[PDB]
Motif scaffolding. Sequence first.
Motif, PDB file in Angstrom:
ATOM      1  N   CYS A  32       0.803  -1.216   0.000  1.00 52.12           N
ATOM      2  CA  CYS A  32       0.000   0.000   0.000  1.00 52.12           C
ATOM      3  C   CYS A  32       0.847   1.282   0.000  1.00 52.12           C
ATOM      4  O   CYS A  32       2.019   1.328   0.401  1.00 52.12           O
ATOM      5  CB  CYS A  32      -0.948  -0.033   1.206  1.00 52.12           C
ATOM      6  N   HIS A  44       0.868   8.228   1.838  1.00 53.15           N
ATOM      7  CA  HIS A  44       2.206   8.187   2.422  1.00 53.15           C
ATOM      8  C   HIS A  44       3.294   7.833   1.372  1.00 53.15           C
ATOM      9  O   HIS A  44       3.193   8.266   0.221  1.00 53.15           O
ATOM     10  CB  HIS A  44       2.068   7.312   3.673  1.00 53.15           C
ATOM     11  N   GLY A  66      -1.129   3.899   1.444  1.00 49.60           N
ATOM     12  CA  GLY A  66      -2.037   4.547   2.397  1.00 49.60           C
ATOM     13  C   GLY A  66      -3.513   4.346   2.075  1.00 49.60           C
ATOM     14  O   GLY A  66      -4.366   4.352   2.954  1.00 49.60           O
ATOM     15  N   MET A  76       5.132   0.873   1.042  1.00 46.38           N
ATOM     16  CA  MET A  76       5.624  -0.097   2.026  1.00 46.38           C
ATOM     17  C   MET A  76       4.984  -1.476   1.845  1.00 46.38           C
ATOM     18  O   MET A  76       4.114  -1.623   0.989  1.00 46.38           O
ATOM     19  CB  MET A  76       5.421   0.468   3.430  1.00 46.38           C
ATOM     20  N   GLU A 114       2.780   3.234   8.370  1.00 44.99           N
ATOM     21  CA  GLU A 114       2.779   4.565   7.738  1.00 44.99           C
ATOM     22  C   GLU A 114       1.355   5.173   7.793  1.00 44.99           C
ATOM     23  O   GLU A 114       1.156   6.197   8.442  1.00 44.99           O
ATOM     24  CB  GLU A 114       3.271   4.451   6.283  1.00 44.99           C
ATOM     25  N   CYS A 115       0.362   4.510   7.170  1.00 45.97           N
ATOM     26  CA  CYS A 115      -1.071   4.762   7.365  1.00 45.97           C
ATOM     27  C   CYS A 115      -1.626   4.088   8.632  1.00 45.97           C
ATOM     28  O   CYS A 115      -2.703   4.473   9.097  1.00 45.97           O
ATOM     29  CB  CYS A 115      -1.858   4.249   6.137  1.00 45.97           C
ATOM     30  N   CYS A 129      -0.150  -1.910   8.730  1.00 43.60           N
ATOM     31  CA  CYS A 129       0.825  -0.905   8.369  1.00 43.60           C
ATOM     32  C   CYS A 129       1.488  -0.221   9.585  1.00 43.60           C
ATOM     33  O   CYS A 129       1.121  -0.421  10.747  1.00 43.60           O
ATOM     34  CB  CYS A 129       0.074   0.053   7.437  1.00 43.60           C
ATOM     35  N   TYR A 138      -4.904  -4.748   7.120  1.00 45.63           N
ATOM     36  CA  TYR A 138      -5.162  -5.415   5.846  1.00 45.63           C
ATOM     37  C   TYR A 138      -5.366  -6.914   6.052  1.00 45.63           C
ATOM     38  O   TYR A 138      -4.760  -7.507   6.948  1.00 45.63           O
ATOM     39  CB  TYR A 138      -3.942  -5.243   4.938  1.00 45.63           C
TER      40      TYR A 138
HETATM   41 ZN    ZN Z   1       0.321   1.959   4.350  1.00 48.84          ZN
END
Ligand code: ZN
Length: 54
Positions: A18, A26, A20, A29, A43-44, A41, A48
Motif C-alpha cells: 500500500c 504516504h 495509504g 511499504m 505509515e497509514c 501498516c 489489511y
Molecule cells: Zn500503508
Amino acid sequence: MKDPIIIESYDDYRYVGCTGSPAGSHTIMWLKPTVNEVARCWECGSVYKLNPVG
Ligand SMILES: [Zn+2]
C-alpha cells in the motif's frame, strides 16, 4: 483486525503493498496477512487482510 481491506491472493500467506489508500497518501511499504490472519501498516497504520481465494 476483523476484515478491513482485502488483498486478493491465490496463495495462503502472500504479501501486500500500500501507499495509504488509492489516494497515494504516504510512501510505499510492504506487509503480509495470511488466509487465517491480518497485518497492520506503520505509515497509514491500516490493517489489511488476506482471502481464502483459489
Ligand atoms: Zn500503508
